[PDB]
Design a binder for this molecule. Structure first.
Ligand SMILES: *[C@@H]1O[C@H](CO)[C@@H](O[C@@H]2O[C@H](CO)[C@@H](O)[C@H](O)[C@H]2NC(C)=O)[C@H](O)[C@H]1NC(C)=O
Lengths: 22, 64
């Protein structure tokens, strides 16, 4: 499903590199 | 926009640090006599804010 994807403690990073889940 | 929040006779002091995705701000406000350097003496800063930002910081810039 193209709505869901993956690429320090509680760090987040929206920069870009991404694989969608099947 | 993944987070948002709202709330030379005087010396304003601050400390900023980012640890485990939390950004901590401390401060103190005090009167002073000589402005040319930081006043010799002691008074500890106390916490204001403790934001759950989750962001990496390596640079900063002041706003005038
Ligand atoms: C926080 O940001 C800095 C950049 O300002 C990141 O540092 C770079 O990380 C990459 C990782 O591939 C390296 O190739 C660069 O050489 C690094 N640059 C410098 C100037 O060190 C840093 O990795 C980030 N921190 C975290 C914990 O993600």
């Amino acid at each position: 499903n193209y709505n869901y994807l993956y690429r320090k403690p509680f760090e987040r990073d929206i920069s870009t590199p991404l694989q969608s889940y099947g | 926009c993944t987070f948002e929040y709202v709330s030379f006779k005087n010396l304003r002091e601050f400390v900023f640090k980012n640890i485990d995705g939390y950004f901590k701000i401390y401060s103190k406000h005090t009167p002073i006599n000589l402005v040319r350097d930081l006043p010799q003496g002691f008074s500890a800063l106390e916490p204001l804010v403790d934001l759950p930002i989750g962001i990496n910081i390596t640079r900063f810039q002041t706003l005038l």
